[PDB]
C-alpha cells in the first residue's frame, strides 16, 4: 500500500541512500540482517511502503542501487546494513563516466538504464499500489546527474501519474567539488524541470554551516551530512507512513507546494537540531521547533529566503503535540513575516502532524519551502555555465560523447525561463 521505489544513483546518491536506509530501518526496527527486532506494531503496520517481505519474514528494502562504477557498490555492500539490499538490485558498470553528464546520459547510461529499467519494472509490478518514486543523486556529478536524469525521464514516460520526487545535491556557491559542475548541473536541471514533481535542493555548504554552527561538530564527515538529509527524507515519508492527527502523503505535499508545474524546487529543513552540549539548556516545544525551522540558518540550501518570498511552505511535525500550538505558531510566523510570504496565496503553510517521533526525540519537524530564493541558486549556475560556455571550455568532452551545442543552449534557455518565472512570481 502506497509503496515507494527508491533509486540511488552515483556516489553521492548511494552514500545518502545508505544513510537513509539505516535511519529508516532504525525507525521501523529492522535488523541490519533484515529481521524485525522492534517493539511497537506501528512499525510493521506500514512496512510495505519501503520494504518487501521475503520468505523468512525478512524485509528487503525496495531500493535500486545504480552506479557506473563498482567501488561505491562494494563499499555499500561491505559496510553495515549492506546485507540488507537485494543482491539483484546492485546494477553497476565498469567505466565510471568520469564527471561527464554526456557519458552518463548517452553512452554508458544507455546500457545501464536498460538494465536498471528492467529492475525497476520488476519492482513496480511487484508493488500493490505504487505511490511514486524517490531518487537520490548529485547534479554536479557524473553518473549521478546524467543517469538520474535519464532514469527520471524514462520512468516518467512509463509511469506519468506517479509521484516522482528527487533529493538532489546541488552545487555549492563558494567551493566546487567538480570543475565541470555548471555543465552537469544545468543539463540536469533542464531535465528535472519537466520530469519531476518535487526536487529537494540540498547544498553541502549549507550542511557544513549547520554542522559547524548549530551542531558544533568539530570534524563533520559525510556521515553527518547524509544523516541530516536522511532525516529530512524520513520526516516526509514518515508523515506518509505512521498514523497521525493530520496525515499528508507525497501527493498532498506536491499539491500544496507546487502552484505551477515548473515551480517545484524546495529548500528542506529539520527543526530539532541541537549540539550535545546545549541539549540540556533547550526546551523542546512547538514554538522552538517552528522558530528553528523558519530560521534562514537552518535551511539546507545556500539560498537566503529573506532575498525572496515564500510561495508555499510545508511543516511536517512528528510527535505528540497540540494542534492548537502548531496552528498558532503557523499563524504567528505568517503574520510576523508577512513581507516574506506571497500575497496572492493566503495561508502559505501546509501542516501535517504524525504521532511517532524519530528515535531518540520527543518532538521533531521537517520544513519544506517553495520560495523564490532558489532563483539565486539557478542564477549562480547560469552565470557559471555561460562563463564556461562563452569561451567553450571543457566542451569537447560533451561534444565527443555525442551531444551538441544546441542542447546546451536549450538547457540554459530553460533555466533562464525558470529564473524568469521565479522572479515574476
Amino acid at each position: 500500500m502506497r509503496e515507494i521505489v527508491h533509486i540511488q544513483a552515483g556516489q553521492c546518491g548511494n552514500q545518502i541512500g545508505a544513510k537513509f536506509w539505516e535511519v529508516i530501518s532504525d525507525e521501523h526496527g529492522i535488523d541490519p540482517s533484515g529481521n524485525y527486532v522492534g517493539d511497537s506494531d506501528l512499525q510493521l503496520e506500514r512496512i510495505s511502503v519501503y520494504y518487501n517481505e521475503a520468505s523468512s519474514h525478512k524485509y528487503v528494502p525496495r531500493a535500486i542501487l545504480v552506479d557506473l562504477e563498482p567501488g561505491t557498490m562494494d563499499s555499500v555492500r561491505s559496510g553495515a546494513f549492506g546485507h540488507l539490499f537485494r543482491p539483484d538490485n546492485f546494477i553497476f558498470g565498469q567505466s565510471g563516466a568520469g564527471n561527464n553528464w554526456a557519458k552518463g546520459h548517452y553512452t554508458e547510461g544507455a546500457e545501464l538504464v536498460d538494465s536498471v529499467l528492467d529492475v525497476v519494472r520488476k519492482e513496480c509490478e511487484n508493488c500493490d499500489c505504487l505511490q511514486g518514486f524517490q531518487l537520490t543523486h548529485s547534479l554536479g556529478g557524473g553518473t549521478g546527474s546524467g543517469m538520474g536524469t535519464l532514469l527520471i525521464s524514462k520512468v516518467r514516460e512509463e509511469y506519468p501519474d506517479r509521484i516522482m520526487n528527487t533529493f538532489s545535491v546541488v552545487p555549492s556557491p563558494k567551493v566546487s567539488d567538480t570543475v565541470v559542475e555548471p555543465y552537469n548541473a544545468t543539463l540536469s536541471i533542464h531535465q528535472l524541470v519537466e520530469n519531476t514533481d518535487e526536487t529537494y535542493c540540498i547544498d553541502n555548504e549549507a550542511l557544513y554551516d549547520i554542522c559547524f554552527r548549530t551542531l558544533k561538530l568539530a570534524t563533520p564527515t559525510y556521515g553527518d551530512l547524509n544523516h541530516l538529509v536522511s532525516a529530512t527524507m524520513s520526516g516526509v515519508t514518515t508523515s506518509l507512513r505512521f498514523p497521525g492527527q493530520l496525515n499528508a502523503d507525497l501527493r498532498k505535499l506536491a499539491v500544496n507546494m507546487v502552484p505551477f508545474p515548473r515551480l517545484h524546487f524546495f529548500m528542506p529543513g529539520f527543526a530539532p537540531l541541537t549540539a550535545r552540549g546545549s541539549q540540556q539548556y533547550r526546551a523542546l516545544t512547538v514554538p522552538e521547533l517552528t522558530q528553528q525551522m523558519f530560521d534562514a540558518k537552518n535551511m539546507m540550501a545556500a539560498c537566503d529566503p529573506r532575498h525572496g518570498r515564500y510561495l508555499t511552505v510545508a511543516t511536517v511535525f512528528r510527535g505528540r503535540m497540540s494542534m492548537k500550538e502548531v496552528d498558532e505558531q503557523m499563524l504567528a510566523i505568517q503574520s510576523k513575516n508577512s513581507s516574506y510570504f506571497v500575497e496572492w496565496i493566503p495561508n502559505n503553510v501546509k501542516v501535517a502532524v504524525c504521532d511517532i517521533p524519530p528515535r531518540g526525540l520527543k518532538m521533531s519537524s521537517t520544513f519544506i519551502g517553495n520560495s523564490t530564493a532558489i532563483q539565486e541558486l539557478f542564477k549562480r549556475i547560469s552565470e557559471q555555465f555561460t562563463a564556461m560556455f562563452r569561451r567553450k571550455a571543457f566542451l569537447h568532452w560533451y561534444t565527443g560523447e555525442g551531444m551538441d551545442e544546441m542542447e546546451f543552449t536549450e538547457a540554459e534557455s530553460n533555466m533562464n525561463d525558470l529564473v524568469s518565472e521565479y522572479q515574476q512570481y
Partner: protein, 110 residues
C-alpha cells in the same frame, strides 16, 4: 562572573552578534557560541552535571540589552534558591555585565 577567564572569551564571540538589533536575534544561534566558549576556556575541566544547567535566556533595543545567563535549577536544590534568588542574581548580573563591557570598550580605545 567569578571565573573571568571564561567571560573574557565569551565577550569576544558575542561582539559580532549583539551589535545587531534585537529583532534579528534568535536564541537557537547563541547556544552554539556559549558552548564554544565553555570548550575553549578553562571551564571545560568541570563537573558535567552543573554544565548541563548553564544556558542562555533572552530578556524581553540592542543585543547588549537582552542577553543574560540563567542557570536554571529544579528539584531538591530548588528549595535553597526558591525562585527569588534567581530573580535576584539576574538583577545583579546586569550590573556586572554593564561594568564589564564598559571596561572592554575602554581597553579597546586604549
Amino acid at each position: 562572573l567569578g571565573q573571568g577567564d571564561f567571560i573574557r572569551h565569551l565577550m569576544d564571540l558575542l561582539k559580532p552578534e549583539l551589535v545587531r538589533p534585537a529583532t534579528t536575534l534568535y536564541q537557537h544561534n547563541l547556544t552554539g557560541i556559549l558552548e564554544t566558549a565553555v570548550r575553549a576556556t578553562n571551564a571545560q575541566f568541570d563537573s558535567p552535571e552543573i554544565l548541563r544547567r548553564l544556558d542562555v535566556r533572552l530578556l524581553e533595543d540592542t543585543g547588549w540589552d537582552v542577553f543574560s545567563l540563567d542557570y536554571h535549577v529544579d528539584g531538591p536544590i530548588a528549595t535553597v534558591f526558591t525562585r527569588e534568588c534567581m530573580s535576584h542574581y539576574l538583577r545583579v548580573f546586569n550590573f556586572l555585565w554593564r561594568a564589564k563591557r564598559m571596561e572592554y570598550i575602554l581597553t579597546d580605545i586604549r
